[PDB]
UniProtKB/Swiss-Prot annotation, chain A:
The family this protein is said to belong to: Belongs to the eukaryotic ribosomal protein eL14 family.
GO molecular function: cadherin binding; RNA binding; structural constituent of ribosome
Keywords from the named record: Acetylation, Cytoplasm, Isopeptide bond, Phosphoprotein, Repeat, Ribonucleoprotein, Ribosomal protein, Ubl conjugation
Crosslink feature (Glycyl lysine isopeptide (Lys-Gly) (interchain with G-Cter in SUMO2)) location: K123
Species in which this protein is naturally found: Homo sapiens (Human)
Cellular localization per UniProt: Cytoplasm
Self-association and partners: Component of the large ribosomal subunit.
Its biological purpose: Component of the large ribosomal subunit. The ribosome is a large ribonucleoprotein complex responsible for the synthesis of proteins in the cell.
Highest taxon above the source species: Eukaryota
GO CC annotation: cytoplasm; cytosol; cytosolic large ribosomal subunit; cytosolic ribosome; extracellular exosome; membrane; postsynaptic density
Protein name: Large ribosomal subunit protein eL14
GO biological process: cytoplasmic translation; ribosomal large subunit biogenesis; rRNA processing; translation
Taxon lineage: Eukaryota, Metazoa, Chordata, Craniata, Vertebrata
From Swiss-Prot, chain B:
Biological process, per Gene Ontology: cellular response to interleukin-4; cytoplasmic translation; translation
PTM description: Constitutively monomethylated at His-244 by METTL18. Methylation at His-244 regulates translation elongation by slowing ribosome traversal on tyrosine codons: slower elongation provides enough time for proper folding of synthesized proteins and prevents cellular aggregation of tyrosine-rich proteins. It is not required for incorporation of RPL3 into ribosomes.
Residues shown, of full length: 2 to 253 of 403
Any one GO molecular-function label of the UniProt entry: structural constituent of ribosome
Name of the molecule in the record: Large ribosomal subunit protein uL3
N6-acetyllysine modified-residue sites: K135
Subunit structure, interactors included: Component of the large ribosomal subunit. Interacts with DHX33.
Swiss-Prot record, chain D:
Gene this chain is encoded by: RPL9
Highest taxon of source: Eukaryota
Identification of the protein by name: Large ribosomal subunit protein uL6
Lineage, highest ranks first: Eukaryota, Metazoa, Chordata, Craniata, Vertebrata
Modified residues (N6-acetyllysine): K121
GO cellular component assignments: cytoplasm; cytosol; cytosolic large ribosomal subunit; cytosolic ribosome; focal adhesion; membrane; nucleus; ribosome
Record's subcellular location: Cytoplasm
Gene Ontology process terms (BP): cytoplasmic translation; translation
Transport in keyword set: no
Cited PROSITE patterns: RIBOSOMAL_L6_2
Assembly, per entry: Component of the large ribosomal subunit.
UniProtKB/Swiss-Prot annotation, chain E:
Lineage per the UniProt record: Eukaryota, Metazoa, Chordata, Craniata, Vertebrata
GO-annotated biological processes: cytoplasmic translation; translation
Family statement drawn from the similarity comment of this UniProt entry: Belongs to the eukaryotic ribosomal protein eL20 family.
Superkingdom, taxonomy of origin: Eukaryota
Protein name (record): Large ribosomal subunit protein eL20
Residues found modified as Phosphotyrosine: Y62
Record-linked InterPro entries: Ribosomal_eL20, Ribosomal_eL20_dom, Ribosomal_eL20_eukaryotes
Keyword Transport in annotation: no
Modified residues (N6-succinyllysine): K75
Keyword Ubl conjugation: yes
Subcellular location: Cytoplasm
Role played: Component of the large ribosomal subunit. The ribosome is a large ribonucleoprotein complex responsible for the synthesis of proteins in the cell.
One GO MF term: RNA binding
Description of how the protein assembles with itself and partners: Component of the large ribosomal subunit. Binds IPO9 with high affinity.
Organism: Homo sapiens
Length: 139, 252, 201, 190, 175, 109
RNA sequence: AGCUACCAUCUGUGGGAUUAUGACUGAACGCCUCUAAGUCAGAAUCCCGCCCAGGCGGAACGAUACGGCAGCGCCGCGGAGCCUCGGUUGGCCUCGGAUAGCCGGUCCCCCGCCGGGGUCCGGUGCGGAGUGCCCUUCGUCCUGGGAAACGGGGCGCGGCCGGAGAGGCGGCCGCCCCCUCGCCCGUCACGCACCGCACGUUCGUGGGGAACCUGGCGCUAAACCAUUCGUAGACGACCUGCU
RNA sequence: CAUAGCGACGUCGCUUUUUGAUCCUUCGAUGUCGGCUCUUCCUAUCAUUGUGAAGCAGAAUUCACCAAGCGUUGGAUUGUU
RNA sequence: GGAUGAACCGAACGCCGGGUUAAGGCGCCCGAUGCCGACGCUCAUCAGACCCCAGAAAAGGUGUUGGUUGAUAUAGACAGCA
């Protein structure tokens, strides 16, 4: 049933902690609770990290366990994890909630106006579709 | 310290609030469990205790000393003039119990039944149900009654018939009739509703409810005896003759 | 807040839910808990049944009618658990207890409303998966509750009606998605406005 | 200690196929269908081959108590496969010293009437579990045959009969009368 | 002795010079302590047991923290210790995985408290070594010596149970 | 046209277990459930608005039955986003569990 | 006559989860194992039923005050005012649930043109998202462009349907009367702009109690005492009767 | 044949139904034995229900488990317990 | 503060405002953990839960978790079957 595993090369998203919101690669495992973790292209130097703050993504890199940051960075740069990550629905969900949080008062006013118009048009078309579907005549 | 010798308790705690009954008629408190496979029937009746006598009969109990022997047995006569059905009540099961859903009364309620609704029938104008009986006759009222019966049919889980006794056929002083709800058992709700509707205003003899040589339950109120002491009330041991402040008491 | 907080008792742990509810009603909020027969208690069923039977044994020796009142319905059991966490012998605690309503099943006022869930009281997150637990409805039924069956039938009826409502809601959502697909050139001016500000990815 | 992984694989024959609905195993063979849900055990059930039909049971981060459930699930699934391929047949001999035990099989082998157990007038009526058929063997003298697909149900029915025929208030070392499960085997013996 | 996160100290001391030996020998110890004050106290505690030395009759010539020489490398630590139980004294050998020696020793203190109810004043660490994976004896440590190690996170418990405190959706566990 | 004040609940007075300092009150502001989120509300004016029987003068208006006790938020309380408030007169105990308005008036943004 | 006696006579009751215990399947521990996960049987015990009482707990139903100015009910938000109690300051109209898994969509088959299956397609740190959605308050006048125009507003009438667990609610039609305005972007000016200041902004035509006027549609009753009964009774209370 | 049933020499407990030890409450007073009456409670179960064991063939008995629902009497002597 | 309490723990006292602590605490009663606290141990059909302190021993357990010593084993362990 499981599809994402903790392994060597697994890319994890950091949910909370000092490095919250960044991507890291799992380099090694310590004692069932921690992992040697290195984000060389996401500005996270090699360090131990608990599995509770990790959320595994679908990206796995190919390097041997406990290899150096040079090889981890090469494997990260080849088949670029930054671009493939930013192209996921996960990353743009994060980005959308970030910009929604940073939205200002004028922006909220403009969003209210646009949402008003959009909702009115959509519900007018919904009523039209209902009225069209109401024309049923068949045994 | 423990009591010197063991003795069973005087009286039962199962009937403990030994108070005057809040009712005079004696209410059923439990009707027989209804199964739809049985035919539609009534589960109760109202009679009046006339008196006791004794009989003679030959016993048909094999293995007994009285097998094929004549014995006398005390019997009680309960006069049971036919009941008259005047109403139908539906109940609905809720997670808080059965609750009364709808009540429909027949047209032409007898005067003796109507006396039950009045404390002073002498001074009253006898106005009860006089505006209710009109909806049996006008069109809108008939439609309303049909709606009420449909709602009982599609919502009620148990129905009962309100039936009253006929005091005019009895030799007693009382003219005010007795009303009670008799649960209709044995069938689907629609079937028992149709049965009750066709029995509205009708007479139900005790033949149609009870049969020969069957075991029934009798619910009533015992004879009143007034304020009584512990020796008569609980049948405790009377204290010795030498007791100072009285011997018909409980010592401790 | 101002509205009535309606919580679903299914899947919740009794004491955790009661502590949350007690604090809420002491903060002046009005709380309605439904499906008190779906509440869980940690520990195996025999363990919890012995606990309630030990409660049943506590009666006033002189007059049990004066003594402790052992309520048998799951709603009343949960209500007494909350009363144990409120200061019910003061006016403030009595008003807080008045603000709380508890039901077995879901009555018609709340059967057509949205039900909140308290994660901090949910069994799925508060109990280890391998631990045993007990159901309040079964516990109540075996200590004297009389309306387990009728509540079950009424719950099944309510679930059928809710399924019909949900199917209508899903049909409306499909139709709205189709409408959004239909009007695209007439909507995309505002859709990009929403997108740039994060609403509607 | 928490073992990282404890896994065990069972092999499924060609004539039988196994479907998974979460932790509910449906085993469909020639002799019918069996179905059993293991939601009380937190395991990962997987089907692997499209040629040989391996079913693998995985437990991750288990302790001593819940590593014991992997082999239990595998044994239950193997018993289900055995039930839908060969079936379970329990043969019960009825032993007695003086009073012969009269066993009458009622409707479709679903009710068993024991009449003269130790010569008492009480009649024992044992209801077999659904899906289990009881019969009197035509080979030996005092022998019952219980045939079914679920080993749980067949063995529970046999135990119902065995515990129904129980001597009381006597030295059971001396009074050996009763019906006892003589042997447990399959049907068609393949 | 209480705790925190421990850190290794090299503590070197010696007796005071006396006109029976003008250059007394120097003794060095590894002390895992919360800070240098506790480190010096424990150094005196241990040299008083081993040699006939006392804090008043001697002095500490050095006390410096020992930084981990490879804190970026997972390694196996074997710890030999002795501790006082409720009914005697026992010698124990335990194994841990960590990046830092002081981290492993802190793990040992927590583990001894967790399993044997032993307190830090009972525990007496006598040797800490970095052992090879082929020399490990504890199966819990050994099960992580897999170059192809792979496992999921099966039952993720929700930890923000109060943000929000009330919600309409029940939390998801599978990820 | 709009609410313009944040909703708060008068939860109680500053207290030990068996002592009560009525001169300062504990407020639970809606939506503020951590101590580090309370920095916005420090120093903000707060009002306990109630109704009485006799009419009282309204500044910039006609006399009505509305009365108010003014105060202000002084500091955070605990880790869960509650705050302390000083009112000009100690809040009546009947107001526990009732609405306090945090007025946004002395704005620092 | 009444009361009364094992000193006469009659009546005394069902189910559920389970304890001890005996078992099933089955690992741990390639064997065994009543146990670990999962199952079965199981009792003067336990709980309930039957039975006794009936909550500062509810339900359904009946009748609801004159032969005289005399009371009452419903309808109108009908009006003008009183006295008294204050809270609140947008709404969410709902699948069932799983958690070692879920949600959504679509073709072939089955249950009488909708649901249930099996494919296939998607999403899953839930975005068909409660960390969400909806509504959104300055008001108007010129004045264009877009959404619409099969549109909106009716304390406007009449009919219908659904909802009983506490329905006290919700929806759909037919006729009529109005605005073509209200939603987005613009053009155009105006409104006490009350001269820095609080209790402002809503629910709300709030709840409760007396009273005045106003119209329409309706109703003309019981309870208690006294008297009587004696199935009752210390007294109250209770069962009864009275053209 | 140690342990069906027993248990020497030792040793660990529980109970407050015995008797002591103490003198904390009460000496401007808590009526002091026993019986009678009556209710309730405990279980360390005599009987009854369901059970396991035996040096349990049956019958009778003995040991133990869940268990206090129910019962545990009439008399001579003695103020007596 | 220890629920409660002459003596325990903190601290000794004029009437007040602000700040901070002690001992002790921070699910709710009840101020404060509504930390995305850390690592383990533990299932009790009489669980356990904080000085004084308000209840328990010897002896047991193939429940589980660590540890010590010894022994066997690819020259093939152990257990099952023969
Ligand atoms: Mg006795
Ligand atoms: Mg005398
Ligand atoms: Mg096997
Ligand atoms: Mg015998
Ligand atoms: Mg008699
Ligand atoms: Mg058992
Ligand atoms: Mg059973
Ligand atoms: Mg003295
Ligand atoms: Mg006196
Ligand atoms: Mg005195
Ligand atoms: Mg006295
Ligand atoms: Mg005992
Ligand atoms: Mg104190
Ligand atoms: Mg204490
Ligand atoms: Mg101070
Ligand atoms: Mg406390
Ligand atoms: Mg608090």
């Amino acid at each position: 049933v499981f599809r994402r595993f903790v392994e060597v090369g697994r890319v994890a998203y950091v949910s909370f902690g000092p490095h919250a919101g960044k991507l890291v690669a799992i380099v090694d495992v310590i004692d069932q609770n921690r992992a040697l973790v290195d984000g060389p292209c996401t500005q996270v130097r090699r360090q131990a990290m608990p599995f509770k703050c990790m959320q595994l993504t679908d990206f796995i890199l190919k390097f041997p366990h406990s290899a150096h940051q040079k090889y981890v960075r090469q494997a990260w740069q080849k088949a670029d994890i930054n671009t493939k990550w930013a192209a996921t629905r996960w990353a743009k969900k994060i980005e959308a909630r970030e910009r929604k949080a940073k939205m200002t008062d004028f922006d909220r006013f403009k969003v209210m106006k646009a949402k008003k118009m959009r909702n009115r048009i959509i519900k007018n078309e919904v009523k039209k579709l209902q009225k069209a579907a109401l024309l049923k005549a068949s045994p | 310290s423990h009591r010197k010798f063991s003795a069973p308790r005087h009286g039962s705690l199962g009937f403990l609030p030994r108070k005057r009954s809040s009712r005079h008629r004696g209410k059923v408190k439990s009707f027989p469990k209804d199964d739809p496979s049985k035919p539609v029937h009534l589960t109760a009746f109202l009679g009046y205790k006339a008196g006791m006598t004794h009989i003679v009969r030959e016993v048909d109990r094999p293995g007994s000393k009285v097998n094929k022997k004549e014995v006398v047995e005390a019997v009680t006569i309960v006069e049971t003039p036919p009941m008259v059905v005047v109403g139908i009540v539906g109940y609905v099961e809720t997670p808080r119990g059965l609750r009364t859903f709808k009540t429909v009364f027949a047209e032409h309620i007898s005067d003796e039944c109507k006396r039950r609704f009045y404390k002073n029938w002498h001074k009253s104008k006898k106005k009860a149900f006089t505006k209710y009986c009109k909806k049996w006759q006008d069109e809108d009222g008939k439609k309303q009654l049909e709606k009420d019966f449909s709602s009982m049919k599609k919502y009620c889980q148990v129905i009962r018939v309100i039936a009253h006794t006929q005091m005019r056929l009895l030799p007693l002083r009382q003219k005010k009739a007795h009303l009670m709800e008799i649960q209709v058992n044995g069938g689907t709700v629609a079937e028992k509703l149709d049965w009750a509707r066709e029995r509205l205003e009708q007479q139900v003899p005790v033949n149609q409810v009870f049969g020969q040589d069957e075991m029934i339950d009798v619910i009533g109120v015992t004879k009143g005896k007034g304020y009584k002491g512990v020796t008569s009330r609980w049948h405790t041991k009377k204290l010795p003759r030498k007791t100072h402040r009285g011997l018909r008491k409980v010592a401790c | 807040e101002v509205q009535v907080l309606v919580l679903d008792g299914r899947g919740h742990l009794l004491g955790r839910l009661a502590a949350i509810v007690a604090k809420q009603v002491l903060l002046g909020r009005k709380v309605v808990v439904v499906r008190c027969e779906g509440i869980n208690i940690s520990g195996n069923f025999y363990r919890n049944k012995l606990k309630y039977l030990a409660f049943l044994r506590k009666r006033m020796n002189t007059n049990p009618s004066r003594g402790p009142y052992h309520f048998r319905a799951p709603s009343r059991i949960f209500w007494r658990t909350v009363r144990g966490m409120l200061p019910h012998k003061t006016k403030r605690g009595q008003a807080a207890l008045d603000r709380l309503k508890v039901f077995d099943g879901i009555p018609p006022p709340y059967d057509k409303k949205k039900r909140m869930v308290v994660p901090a009281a949910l069994k799925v997150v508060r109990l280890k998966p391998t631990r045993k637990f007990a159901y309040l409805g079964r516990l109540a039924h075996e200590v004297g509750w009389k309306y387990q069956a009728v509540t079950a039938t009424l719950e099944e009826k309510r679930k059928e009606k809710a399924k019909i409502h949900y199917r209508k809601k899903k049909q409306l959502m499909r139709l709205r998605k189709q409408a959004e697909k239909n009007v695209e050139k007439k909507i995309d001016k505002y859709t990009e406005v929403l997108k740039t500000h994060g609403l509607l990815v | 200690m928490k073992t990282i992984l404890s896994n065990q694989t069972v092999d499924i024959p060609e004539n039988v196929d196994i479907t998974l609905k979460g932790r509910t195993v449906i085993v469909k063979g020639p002799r019918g269908t069996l179905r059993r849900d293991f939601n009380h055990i937190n395991v990962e059930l997987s089907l692997l081959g499209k040629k040989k039909k391996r079913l693998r049971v995985d437990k991750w981060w288990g302790n001593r108590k819940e590593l014991a459930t992997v082999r239990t699930i595998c044994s239950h699934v193997q018993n289900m496969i055995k039930g839908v391929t060969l079936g379970f047949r329990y043969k019960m001999r009825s032993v007695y010293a003086h009073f012969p035990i009269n066993v009458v099989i009622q409707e479709n082998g679903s009710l068993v009437e024991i009449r003269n157990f130790l010569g008492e007038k009480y009649i024992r009526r044992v209801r077999m579990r659904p899906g289990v058929a009881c019969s009197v063997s035509q080979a030996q003298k005092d022998e019952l045959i219980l045939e079914g697909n679920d080993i749980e149900l067949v063995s529970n029915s046999a135990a119902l009969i065995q515990q129904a025929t129980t001597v009381k208030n006597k030295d059971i070392r001396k009074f050996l009368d009763g019906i006892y499960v003589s042997e447990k085997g399959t049907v068609q013996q393949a | 002795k209480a705790s925190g996160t421990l850190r290794e100290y090299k503590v070197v001391g010696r007796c005071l010079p006396t006109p029976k030996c003008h250059t007394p020998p120097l003794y060095r110890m590894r002390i895992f302590a919360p800070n240098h004050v506790v480190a010096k106290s424990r150094f005196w505690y241990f040299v008083s047991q081993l040699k006939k030395m006392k804090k008043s009759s001697g002095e500490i010539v050095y006390c410096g923290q020992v930084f981990e020489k490879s804190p970026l490398r997972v390694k196996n630590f074997g710890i030999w210790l002795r501790y006082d139980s409720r009914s005697g004294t026992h010698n124990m050998y335990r194994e841990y995985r960590d990046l830092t020696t002081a981290g492993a020793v802190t793990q040992c203190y927590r583990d001894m408290g967790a399993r044997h109810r032993a307190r830090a004043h009972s525990i007496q660490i006598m040797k800490v070594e970095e052992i090879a994976a082929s020399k490990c004896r504890r199966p819990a440590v050994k099960q992580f010596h897999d170059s192809k190690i792979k496992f999921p996170l099966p039952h993720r418990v929700l930890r923000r149970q109060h943000k929000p405190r009330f919600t309409t959706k029940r939390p998801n566990t599978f990820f | 046209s709009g609410r313009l004040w944040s909703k708060a609940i008068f939860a109680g007075y500053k207290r030990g277990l068996r002592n009560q300092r009525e001169h300062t009150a504990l407020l639970k502001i809606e939506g503020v459930y951590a101590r580090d989120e309370t920095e916005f509300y420090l120093g903000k004016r707060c009002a306990y608005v109630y109704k009485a029987k006799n009419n009282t003068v309204t500044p910039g208006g006609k006399p009505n039955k509305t009365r108010v006790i003014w105060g202000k938020v002084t500091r955070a309380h605990g880790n869960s986003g509650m705050v302390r408030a000083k009112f000009r007169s100690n809040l009546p105990a009947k107001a526990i569990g009732h609405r306090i308005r945090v007025m946004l008036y002395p704005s620092r943004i």
